[PDB]
Paper text:
Like all the other coronaviruses (CoVs), PEDV has a RNA genome that encodes two polyproteins, pp1a and pp1ab. 3CLpro recognizes a conserved cleavage site containing a hydrophobic residue (preferably L) at the P2 position, a Q at the P1 position, and a small aliphatic amino acid residue (S, G or A) at the P1′ position.
To elucidate the inhibitory mechanism and provide a structural model for further inhibitor optimization of GC376 against the PEDV 3CLpro, we determined the structure of the 3CLpro–GC376 complex (1.65 Å). Investigation into the substrate-binding site revealed a prominent electron density for GC376 in two monomers, especially in subunit A. The bisulfite group of GC376 was removed, and the compound formed a covalent bond with Cys 144. The glutamine surrogate ring and the leucine of GC376 fit comfortably into the S1 and S2 binding sites, respectively. Four residues of the PEDV 3CLpro, Cys 144, His 162, Gln 163 and Glu 165, are involved in the hydrogen bond interactions with GC376. Thr 47 in the loop and Asn 141, which is located on another side of the binding pocket, both protrude into the pocket, forming a narrow entrance with the width of ~8 Å.
Numbering used by the authors:
A (entry chain B), B (entry chain A): 1 to 299
Amino acid sequence: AGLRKMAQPSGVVEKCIVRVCYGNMALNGLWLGDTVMCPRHVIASSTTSTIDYDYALSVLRLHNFSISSGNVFLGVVGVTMRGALLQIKVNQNNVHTPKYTYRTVRPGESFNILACYDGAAAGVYGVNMRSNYTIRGSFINGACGSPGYNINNGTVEFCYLHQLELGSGCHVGSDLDGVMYGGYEDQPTLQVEGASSLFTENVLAFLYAALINGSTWWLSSSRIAVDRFNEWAVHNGMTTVVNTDCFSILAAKTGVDVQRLLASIQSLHKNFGGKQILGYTSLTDEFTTGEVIRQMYGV
Amino acid sequence: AGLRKMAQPSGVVEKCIVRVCYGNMALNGLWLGDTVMCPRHVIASSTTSTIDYDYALSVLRLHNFSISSGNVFLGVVGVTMRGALLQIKVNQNNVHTPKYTYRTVRPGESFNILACYDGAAAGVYGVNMRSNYTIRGSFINGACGSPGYNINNGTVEFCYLHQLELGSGCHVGSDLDGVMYGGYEDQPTLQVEGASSLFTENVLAFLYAALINGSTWWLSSSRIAVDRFNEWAVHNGMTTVVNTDCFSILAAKTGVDVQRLLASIQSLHKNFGGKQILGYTSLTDEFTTGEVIRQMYGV
Ligand SMILES: *[C@H](O)[C@H](C[C@@H]1CCNC1=O)NC(=O)[C@H](CC(C)C)NC(=O)OCc1ccccc1
Ligand SMILES: *[C@H](O)[C@H](C[C@@H]1CCNC1=O)NC(=O)[C@H](CC(C)C)NC(=O)OCc1ccccc1
């Protein structure tokens, strides 16, 4: 019993973290095979104005990099621009490289953050990509380059490298192709986050978890159809429901259909805060159907 | 920016997990040196009526154990009772044993859980020991023997091995000395959790984190002496405050003294009136001052 937001174990990723320094900047990189990937703002000069990154690369000198795995320093052979990342070729292969892939995550999907400082892992926690392509992380100065990952059947799927914090305190990365999530710029100029909405398909998963754990006080007797709910959602800070086949096994185990949970969601919006669900805010959207099925029933 | 309940990286503990099977029982053990520690109910022939564990040990057949680290099987040399644990001497030293200590945690303290099934880590999350010596876990069948840990200066401090779930779904372990937290029994008979109170010093830490992250709408201009607050606390489900030295740094960073936060707690203890603080709709006691200082300022 219980429901907790968990991270997948971090050991296989920990041995891939390096410290990457250039000039006055220091952040983290991801060392796989004979390449280190890191946010390109490590080569930028200090300025609140816009950075011409092609110019910064044109004046770069390879001997000004300092890249280290612990107290072992890696020699730099070359550098390539990769979107908002640098691909740095080094003279040593990481013998602890796991089997890995890259994958760009989509809104509402969960993954794991390995928060790193000075080229070493400090903390690990699960996150969920919001509708405005930000995550609700915890990062302070020095965290850039911290990776996000999922572990799928022995292969590490890398999906995020940390890049910046917005004025609201939420967090933005790029994928490992160098594409910034949400299209935000890797620039120091002021940008404000897009509007954020609760991810309704994840709220549905959370409410099924609550039923399985014996929480029913919030359950409506009424029903509302998916498309009518979706019309209400986009005026009330919630995302539309697109996928429902994923709920079939949860509806079968609990005896409760999606239309009943959608009506419950509308009512919870009306006395919002009056009571928690399993000790959480009643409209919690950080859990996916997959995470719930794993925690309730196993892998 | 941000505040997240996070775990310390799990890599050094993952290499210590083994699968321990006996008869119809399957759980997890902790392999350090040439010893495997696991909950002694692995040798119980029921978990349904009161168990004479000394008898169970006296009729044990060493060969009926199956202990494995991945696909490496460990030979059992002998078995000793250690409180609510078995101390199993095995024929191989774990070469990946980290530097480690044991320590029994106290109410209000945080640590990390590595949830394990079939002798392998599946998830990691942070917890905080309640005043009734239970934790807010997520565990299903097969999780017993999952360890709790902290890491300090590269030394692993083991403080918990998972033992049982109480009727309400909260979770109980033993320390690595074999002493059950809270004096609960490692017996299948009926047990109910004791009364629980919110840990006020942790609620204070959370409100300081909220201030550092720009959440101030709830902050009282009024204040209340620690004396007066403690009279209210014991009739309102909260612990008394005696240590305020742990807030000196946070009060200096924010300019807000403890007495104003105590008045705010009184106002917020019933509800947040429909608003949120760092995403919460009710007070949380899961964060210590140490976690908050680390996440806001590093170390
Ligand atoms: C890389 O370590 C850093 C991570 C930030 C630092 C504070 N919390 C974080 O997550 N990223 C940057 O400093 C980034 C560099 C740009 C060239 C992309 N800029 C940034 O995040 O500053 C925006 C900001 C505004 C207001 C408060 C805090 C940060
Ligand atoms: C060890 O794997 C197991 C972990 C429980 C199982 C369900 N969630 C857990 O944390 N511990 C026990 O099964 C324990 C055995 C002692 C009483 C000897 N008994 C227990 O936890 O209460 C029984 C129970 C079983 C299944 C669900 C809820 C309670």
